[PDB]
Short mmCIF file of C-alpha atoms in Angstrom, two decimals:
data_model
loop_
_atom_site.label_atom_id
_atom_site.label_comp_id
_atom_site.label_asym_id
_atom_site.label_seq_id
_atom_site.Cartn_x
_atom_site.Cartn_y
_atom_site.Cartn_z
CA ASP S 1 -14.53 7.82 -16.79
CA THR S 2 -17.85 8.37 -14.89
CA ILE S 3 -20.95 9.81 -16.52
CA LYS S 4 -23.57 11.24 -14.24
CA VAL S 5 -27.29 11.17 -14.85
CA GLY S 6 -29.43 13.60 -12.75
CA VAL S 7 -32.80 12.13 -11.90
CA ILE S 8 -35.52 14.60 -10.75
CA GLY S 9 -38.60 13.01 -9.32
CA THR S 10 -41.03 12.98 -6.41
CA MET S 11 -38.82 11.13 -3.87
CA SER S 12 -40.66 12.08 -0.70
CA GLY S 13 -44.03 13.50 0.23
CA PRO S 14 -47.44 12.87 -1.10
CA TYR S 15 -46.15 11.61 -4.49
CA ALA S 16 -43.23 9.70 -3.07
CA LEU S 17 -44.24 6.42 -4.59
CA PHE S 18 -43.80 7.81 -8.12
CA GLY S 19 -40.23 9.02 -7.77
CA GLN S 20 -39.24 6.04 -5.78
CA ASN S 21 -40.52 4.05 -8.73
CA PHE S 22 -38.10 5.92 -10.99
CA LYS S 23 -35.27 4.59 -8.76
CA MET S 24 -36.91 1.07 -8.71
CA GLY S 25 -36.96 1.01 -12.50
CA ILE S 26 -33.36 2.24 -12.85
CA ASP S 27 -32.26 -0.25 -10.25
CA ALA S 28 -34.08 -3.02 -12.29
CA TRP S 29 -32.18 -1.86 -15.43
CA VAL S 30 -28.89 -1.91 -13.59
CA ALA S 31 -29.62 -5.34 -11.99
CA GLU S 32 -29.90 -6.76 -15.63
CA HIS S 33 -27.49 -4.65 -17.45
CA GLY S 34 -24.82 -3.37 -15.05
CA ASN S 35 -23.43 0.07 -14.56
CA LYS S 36 -20.99 0.21 -17.47
CA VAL S 37 -21.21 1.26 -21.05
CA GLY S 38 -17.92 0.33 -22.59
CA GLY S 39 -15.33 1.75 -20.24
CA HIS S 40 -17.63 4.39 -18.73
CA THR S 41 -19.42 3.95 -15.45
CA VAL S 42 -22.87 5.50 -15.31
CA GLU S 43 -23.99 6.99 -12.02
CA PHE S 44 -27.54 8.10 -11.24
CA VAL S 45 -28.06 10.82 -8.68
CA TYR S 46 -31.52 11.69 -7.34
CA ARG S 47 -33.14 15.08 -6.57
CA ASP S 48 -36.53 15.63 -4.95
CA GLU S 49 -39.15 17.33 -7.16
CA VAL S 50 -41.74 17.15 -4.22
CA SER S 51 -44.64 18.92 -5.91
CA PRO S 52 -45.82 20.66 -9.05
CA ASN S 53 -43.64 23.64 -8.12
CA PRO S 54 -41.40 24.58 -10.93
CA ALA S 55 -38.99 26.78 -8.87
CA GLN S 56 -37.77 23.76 -6.97
CA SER S 57 -37.24 21.64 -10.19
CA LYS S 58 -35.54 24.43 -12.21
CA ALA S 59 -33.10 25.03 -9.21
CA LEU S 60 -32.49 21.24 -8.98
CA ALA S 61 -31.63 21.04 -12.70
CA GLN S 62 -29.32 24.06 -12.52
CA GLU S 63 -27.41 22.44 -9.61
CA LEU S 64 -27.15 19.18 -11.47
CA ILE S 65 -25.78 20.89 -14.56
CA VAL S 66 -23.42 23.30 -12.66
CA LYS S 67 -22.25 21.45 -9.60
CA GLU S 68 -22.78 17.74 -10.42
CA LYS S 69 -21.83 18.28 -14.13
CA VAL S 70 -24.31 15.70 -15.34
CA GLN S 71 -24.43 14.70 -19.05
CA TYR S 72 -28.09 13.69 -18.88
CA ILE S 73 -31.23 14.63 -16.92
CA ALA S 74 -34.12 12.22 -16.48
CA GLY S 75 -37.45 12.08 -14.74
CA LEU S 76 -39.95 14.92 -14.16
CA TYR S 77 -43.22 13.67 -12.69
CA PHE S 78 -45.12 16.95 -13.38
CA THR S 79 -45.67 18.79 -16.61
CA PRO S 80 -44.84 22.23 -15.24
CA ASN S 81 -41.54 21.04 -13.83
CA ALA S 82 -40.57 19.49 -17.14
CA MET S 83 -41.47 22.73 -18.90
CA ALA S 84 -39.26 24.69 -16.57
CA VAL S 85 -36.26 22.45 -17.12
CA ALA S 86 -36.66 22.09 -20.91
CA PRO S 87 -35.18 25.47 -21.86
CA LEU S 88 -31.95 24.74 -19.97
CA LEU S 89 -31.05 21.77 -22.04
CA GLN S 90 -29.71 22.99 -25.35
CA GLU S 91 -27.21 25.52 -23.92
CA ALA S 92 -26.20 23.05 -21.10
CA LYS S 93 -25.62 20.48 -23.86
CA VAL S 94 -27.72 17.98 -21.78
CA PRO S 95 -30.57 15.85 -22.96
CA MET S 96 -33.65 15.18 -20.82
CA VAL S 97 -35.34 11.83 -20.87
CA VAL S 98 -38.86 12.43 -19.55
CA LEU S 99 -40.19 9.54 -17.44
CA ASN S 100 -43.65 10.82 -16.72
CA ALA S 101 -44.75 14.44 -17.55
CA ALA S 102 -47.39 13.72 -20.16
CA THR S 103 -48.37 17.00 -21.87
CA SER S 104 -47.98 16.67 -25.64
CA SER S 105 -46.14 19.96 -26.23
CA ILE S 106 -43.29 19.18 -23.86
CA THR S 107 -41.18 17.49 -26.53
CA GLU S 108 -41.48 20.54 -28.77
CA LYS S 109 -39.69 22.75 -26.24
CA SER S 110 -36.20 21.48 -27.00
CA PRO S 111 -34.51 19.20 -29.57
CA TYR S 112 -32.79 17.36 -26.73
CA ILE S 113 -35.90 15.72 -25.21
CA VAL S 114 -37.02 12.14 -25.55
CA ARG S 115 -40.06 10.80 -23.64
CA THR S 116 -40.41 7.15 -22.49
CA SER S 117 -43.70 7.57 -20.52
CA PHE S 118 -46.91 8.55 -22.37
CA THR S 119 -49.05 11.52 -23.40
CA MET S 120 -52.45 12.37 -22.38
CA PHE S 121 -53.84 12.49 -25.91
CA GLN S 122 -52.24 9.15 -26.52
CA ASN S 123 -54.21 7.45 -23.75
CA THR S 124 -57.39 9.53 -23.96
CA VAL S 125 -58.24 9.08 -27.63
CA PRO S 126 -58.75 5.36 -27.01
CA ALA S 127 -60.67 6.15 -23.84
CA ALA S 128 -63.17 8.19 -25.86
CA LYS S 129 -63.43 5.41 -28.48
CA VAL S 130 -64.18 2.87 -25.70
CA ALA S 131 -66.64 5.17 -24.02
CA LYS S 132 -68.72 5.01 -27.21
CA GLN S 133 -68.28 1.25 -27.62
CA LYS S 134 -69.52 0.76 -24.05
CA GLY S 135 -72.74 2.66 -24.71
CA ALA S 136 -72.05 5.99 -23.03
CA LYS S 137 -74.35 8.79 -24.20
CA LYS S 138 -73.79 11.71 -21.85
CA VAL S 139 -70.38 12.24 -20.33
CA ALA S 140 -69.30 14.57 -17.45
CA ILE S 141 -65.49 15.44 -17.84
CA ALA S 142 -63.67 16.33 -14.68
CA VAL S 143 -59.92 17.10 -15.10
CA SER S 144 -57.18 18.82 -12.99
CA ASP S 145 -56.74 22.39 -14.15
CA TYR S 146 -53.27 22.28 -15.66
CA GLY S 147 -51.47 21.08 -18.80
CA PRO S 148 -52.19 17.36 -18.90
CA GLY S 149 -55.77 17.81 -17.63
CA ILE S 150 -56.47 20.34 -20.39
CA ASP S 151 -55.00 18.03 -23.02
CA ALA S 152 -57.21 15.13 -21.68
CA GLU S 153 -60.33 17.21 -21.76
CA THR S 154 -59.55 18.53 -25.36
CA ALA S 155 -58.78 14.98 -26.55
CA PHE S 156 -61.91 13.47 -25.00
CA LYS S 157 -64.35 16.08 -26.15
CA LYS S 158 -63.16 16.01 -29.76
CA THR S 159 -63.14 12.31 -30.10
CA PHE S 160 -66.30 11.44 -28.19
CA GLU S 161 -68.32 14.19 -29.83
CA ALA S 162 -67.20 12.99 -33.28
CA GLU S 163 -68.55 9.56 -32.44
CA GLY S 164 -71.93 11.16 -31.64
CA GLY S 165 -71.64 11.38 -27.91
CA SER S 166 -72.60 14.32 -25.69
CA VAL S 167 -70.43 16.13 -23.19
CA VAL S 168 -72.90 17.45 -20.63
CA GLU S 169 -70.45 18.91 -18.18
CA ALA S 170 -66.71 19.77 -18.25
CA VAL S 171 -65.04 20.96 -15.10
CA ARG S 172 -61.45 22.01 -14.54
CA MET S 173 -60.58 21.37 -10.90
CA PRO S 174 -57.73 23.40 -9.43
CA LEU S 175 -54.90 21.06 -8.25
CA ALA S 176 -55.49 22.45 -4.76
CA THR S 177 -58.83 20.70 -4.69
CA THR S 178 -59.06 18.20 -1.82
CA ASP S 179 -62.89 18.21 -1.23
CA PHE S 180 -64.45 16.22 -4.07
CA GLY S 181 -67.95 16.15 -2.56
CA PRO S 182 -69.08 19.31 -4.47
CA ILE S 183 -67.89 18.02 -7.84
CA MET S 184 -69.79 14.71 -7.37
CA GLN S 185 -72.93 16.74 -6.68
CA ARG S 186 -72.45 18.66 -9.89
CA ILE S 187 -71.93 15.41 -11.82
CA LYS S 188 -75.10 13.90 -10.33
CA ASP S 189 -76.93 17.04 -11.30
CA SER S 190 -75.65 16.92 -14.93
CA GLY S 191 -77.39 13.69 -15.81
CA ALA S 192 -74.31 12.06 -17.15
CA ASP S 193 -74.17 8.27 -17.42
CA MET S 194 -70.38 8.23 -17.42
CA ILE S 195 -67.52 10.31 -16.05
CA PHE S 196 -64.25 10.76 -17.79
CA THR S 197 -61.48 11.94 -15.42
CA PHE S 198 -57.82 12.67 -15.11
CA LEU S 199 -55.90 13.86 -12.03
CA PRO S 200 -52.20 13.27 -11.42
CA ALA S 201 -51.74 9.86 -9.78
CA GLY S 202 -51.47 10.32 -6.03
CA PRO S 203 -53.72 11.71 -3.37
CA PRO S 204 -55.92 13.60 -5.93
CA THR S 205 -56.81 10.41 -7.72
CA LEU S 206 -57.43 8.43 -4.55
CA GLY S 207 -59.56 11.29 -3.20
CA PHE S 208 -61.63 11.58 -6.45
CA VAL S 209 -62.34 7.86 -6.80
CA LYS S 210 -63.18 7.38 -3.11
CA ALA S 211 -65.69 10.35 -3.40
CA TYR S 212 -67.21 8.92 -6.62
CA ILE S 213 -67.83 5.55 -4.85
CA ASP S 214 -68.77 6.94 -1.37
CA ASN S 215 -71.26 9.49 -2.65
CA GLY S 216 -73.09 6.70 -4.53
CA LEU S 217 -72.53 7.58 -8.13
CA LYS S 218 -71.04 4.28 -9.08
CA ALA S 219 -73.96 2.35 -7.55
CA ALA S 220 -76.37 4.67 -9.31
CA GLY S 221 -75.02 3.46 -12.62
CA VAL S 222 -72.65 6.36 -13.38
CA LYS S 223 -69.76 4.57 -14.91
CA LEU S 224 -66.10 5.75 -14.70
CA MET S 225 -63.71 6.01 -17.54
CA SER S 226 -60.25 7.36 -16.80
CA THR S 227 -56.71 7.21 -17.94
CA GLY S 228 -54.65 4.70 -15.88
CA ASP S 229 -53.33 7.62 -13.74
CA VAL S 230 -56.51 7.30 -11.83
CA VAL S 231 -56.11 3.63 -10.75
CA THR S 232 -52.40 3.04 -10.23
CA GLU S 233 -51.74 -0.44 -8.76
CA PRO S 234 -50.53 0.48 -5.36
CA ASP S 235 -53.69 2.43 -4.60
CA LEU S 236 -56.03 -0.42 -5.83
CA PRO S 237 -56.09 -1.83 -2.20
CA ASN S 238 -57.00 1.65 -0.89
CA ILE S 239 -59.76 2.04 -3.39
CA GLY S 240 -60.68 -1.48 -2.37
CA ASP S 241 -63.16 -3.90 -3.91
CA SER S 242 -65.60 -1.14 -4.60
CA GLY S 243 -63.27 -0.12 -7.39
CA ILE S 244 -64.08 -3.37 -9.25
CA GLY S 245 -65.30 -2.40 -12.67
CA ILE S 246 -63.70 0.97 -13.12
CA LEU S 247 -62.40 1.23 -16.72
CA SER S 248 -59.12 2.90 -17.69
CA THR S 249 -56.88 3.25 -20.69
CA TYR S 250 -53.13 3.11 -20.23
CA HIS S 251 -49.89 1.98 -21.77
CA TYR S 252 -48.73 -0.18 -18.77
CA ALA S 253 -50.22 -2.58 -16.27
CA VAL S 254 -48.19 -4.58 -13.73
CA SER S 255 -50.46 -7.50 -14.78
CA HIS S 256 -49.23 -7.28 -18.44
CA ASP S 257 -48.74 -10.86 -19.66
CA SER S 258 -45.48 -11.06 -21.60
CA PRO S 259 -42.10 -12.62 -21.02
CA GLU S 260 -40.51 -9.13 -20.92
CA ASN S 261 -42.88 -7.99 -18.14
CA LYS S 262 -42.25 -11.13 -16.18
CA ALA S 263 -38.55 -10.48 -16.50
CA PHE S 264 -38.94 -6.81 -15.50
CA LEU S 265 -40.98 -7.78 -12.41
CA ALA S 266 -38.24 -10.22 -11.39
CA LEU S 267 -35.58 -7.51 -11.84
CA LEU S 268 -37.59 -5.00 -9.81
CA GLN S 269 -37.59 -7.54 -6.99
CA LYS S 270 -33.92 -8.27 -7.47
CA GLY S 271 -33.12 -4.53 -7.38
CA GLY S 272 -35.00 -4.51 -3.99
CA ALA S 273 -38.58 -3.35 -4.80
CA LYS S 274 -41.85 -4.81 -3.49
CA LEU S 275 -44.25 -5.80 -6.33
CA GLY S 276 -47.05 -4.18 -4.49
CA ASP S 277 -45.39 -0.81 -4.83
CA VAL S 278 -44.72 -1.00 -8.54
CA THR S 279 -46.41 1.22 -11.08
CA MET S 280 -46.05 3.01 -14.41
CA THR S 281 -43.20 5.31 -13.63
CA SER S 282 -40.88 2.26 -13.03
CA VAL S 283 -41.34 1.05 -16.62
CA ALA S 284 -40.76 4.51 -18.02
CA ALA S 285 -37.49 4.66 -16.00
CA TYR S 286 -36.37 1.22 -17.14
CA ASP S 287 -36.80 2.14 -20.80
CA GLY S 288 -35.37 5.59 -20.04
CA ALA S 289 -32.18 3.92 -18.73
CA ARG S 290 -32.08 1.85 -21.94
CA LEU S 291 -32.10 5.06 -24.03
CA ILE S 292 -29.45 6.72 -21.81
CA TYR S 293 -27.23 3.67 -22.21
CA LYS S 294 -27.71 3.81 -26.03
CA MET S 295 -26.86 7.59 -26.08
CA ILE S 296 -23.71 6.98 -24.09
CA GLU S 297 -22.73 4.11 -26.44
CA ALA S 298 -23.38 6.23 -29.48
CA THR S 299 -21.31 9.14 -28.25
CA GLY S 300 -18.53 7.09 -26.71
CA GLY S 301 -19.25 8.80 -23.43
CA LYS S 302 -18.55 12.20 -24.92
CA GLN S 303 -21.00 15.04 -24.18
CA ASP S 304 -22.59 15.39 -27.62
CA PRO S 305 -26.34 15.76 -27.29
CA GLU S 306 -27.13 16.09 -30.96
CA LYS S 307 -25.34 12.76 -31.64
CA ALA S 308 -27.05 11.21 -28.60
CA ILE S 309 -30.58 12.09 -29.59
CA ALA S 310 -29.91 11.02 -33.19
CA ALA S 311 -29.10 7.52 -31.91
CA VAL S 312 -32.53 7.04 -30.22
CA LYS S 313 -35.06 9.14 -32.12
CA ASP S 314 -36.32 6.34 -34.23
CA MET S 315 -35.37 3.31 -32.17
CA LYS S 316 -37.68 0.29 -31.91
CA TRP S 317 -37.55 -2.32 -29.11
CA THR S 318 -39.65 -4.49 -26.84
CA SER S 319 -40.53 -2.90 -23.52
CA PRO S 320 -42.00 -4.69 -20.46
CA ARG S 321 -45.17 -2.78 -21.48
CA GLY S 322 -45.30 -4.13 -25.05
CA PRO S 323 -43.63 -3.25 -28.42
CA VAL S 324 -42.51 0.38 -28.57
CA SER S 325 -40.67 2.80 -30.66
CA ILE S 326 -39.63 6.52 -30.71
CA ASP S 327 -41.50 8.57 -33.37
CA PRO S 328 -38.81 10.90 -34.80
CA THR S 329 -41.30 13.59 -35.61
CA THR S 330 -42.17 14.08 -31.91
CA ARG S 331 -39.43 12.25 -29.94
CA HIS S 332 -42.26 10.57 -28.07
CA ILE S 333 -42.74 6.82 -27.45
CA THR S 334 -45.23 5.10 -29.74
CA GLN S 335 -46.87 2.20 -27.93
CA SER S 336 -50.00 0.19 -27.42
CA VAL S 337 -52.75 1.69 -25.26
CA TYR S 338 -54.75 -0.99 -23.40
CA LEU S 339 -58.21 -0.91 -22.05
CA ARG S 340 -58.29 -2.26 -18.58
CA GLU S 341 -60.85 -2.97 -15.94
CA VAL S 342 -60.24 -3.17 -12.14
CA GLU S 343 -60.79 -6.88 -11.27
CA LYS S 344 -59.82 -9.46 -8.73
CA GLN S 345 -57.33 -12.02 -9.95
CA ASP S 346 -55.95 -14.71 -7.60
CA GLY S 347 -57.45 -12.77 -4.74
CA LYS S 348 -55.61 -9.54 -5.70
CA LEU S 349 -56.98 -6.41 -7.40
CA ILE S 350 -55.39 -5.72 -10.71
CA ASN S 351 -55.97 -3.62 -13.81
CA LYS S 352 -56.88 -6.45 -16.18
CA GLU S 353 -55.98 -5.69 -19.80
CA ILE S 354 -58.98 -6.55 -21.89
CA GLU S 355 -58.35 -4.83 -25.26
CA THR S 356 -55.23 -3.52 -27.13
CA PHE S 357 -55.09 -0.43 -29.36
CA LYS S 358 -51.68 -0.88 -31.25
CA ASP S 359 -49.21 1.75 -32.33
CA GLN S 360 -50.69 4.85 -30.81
CA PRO S 361 -48.60 7.93 -31.40
CA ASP S 362 -48.84 11.24 -29.67
CA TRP S 363 -52.33 12.17 -31.01
CA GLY S 364 -51.79 15.71 -29.48
CA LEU S 365 -49.13 16.52 -32.08
CA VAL S 366 -49.46 14.23 -35.18
CA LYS S 367 -52.64 15.82 -36.53
CA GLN S 368 -51.74 19.42 -35.85
#
């Protein structure tokens, strides 16, 4: 028969690159692995999340369940959208494979969730370790005022303070923030020698970074540490060469040097993508498709979400990003977190991986 997978992501609008990357990654998977599992054809259908507006995503999921009769849902760029869809899953008998939404507690909301992206704690704990290693003494934290921003702030404060550092300012910026001039002035005023930031990848991150540079903070010796959300590859040319030297921690770089990543890049191209448009949501989607294929294999194409999740919840494999596994205690992907620096390579700006922190779990859940 035919098994439908409903993919919710930001397919148009300000965040269009990120949902289009879900499709790019799925298309790469299918270019290499085909559209069959045994005798079942797998069909992906796409729905437009647009913005962090949970009414839209909840209505999309309900339509996918009721009218499309999907067996699996995947995607969810924004934490609040994933949170709104999660309670539907067990009674619909449909698992959700989360391909971005990074708040730690998401996986706790339903037994039928597995996440192939990352969490904020996962990437931020290394960021706070590196901040110390790089000599930071006084840090200003600026994060978007919603789930993943709050996680990032909490993770950074705890870790950095334990290493003896000082957090001299901590600001939660409403997501509606477009004018970053005033926050840069507050940061200047704080005396911080380094900023730690998270905003969702997209216009907010481009706006923040451009204001940090153009208001002179970077040239005044205020360093930037971020998660990799803040320096996604397709925006590096828009940041431009003034971005050189920005530090970020993240689980994936397009520049990752492994045979599996080289293969993945070729498949992205084969499936029709431009390398210059690739970023992290494509690798989450590629590995998400792997897990959906495994779930269909394990269930024989039957709608049996308990059996499906059981087949992936402690799987280990090699991703384009590095070695990975699912931690059964959280249903989240354990993975390396890399330190990177924005640099030119072969005349192109990249996030150059300069240190590896192996086997990072979801630090937001595993110590609680």
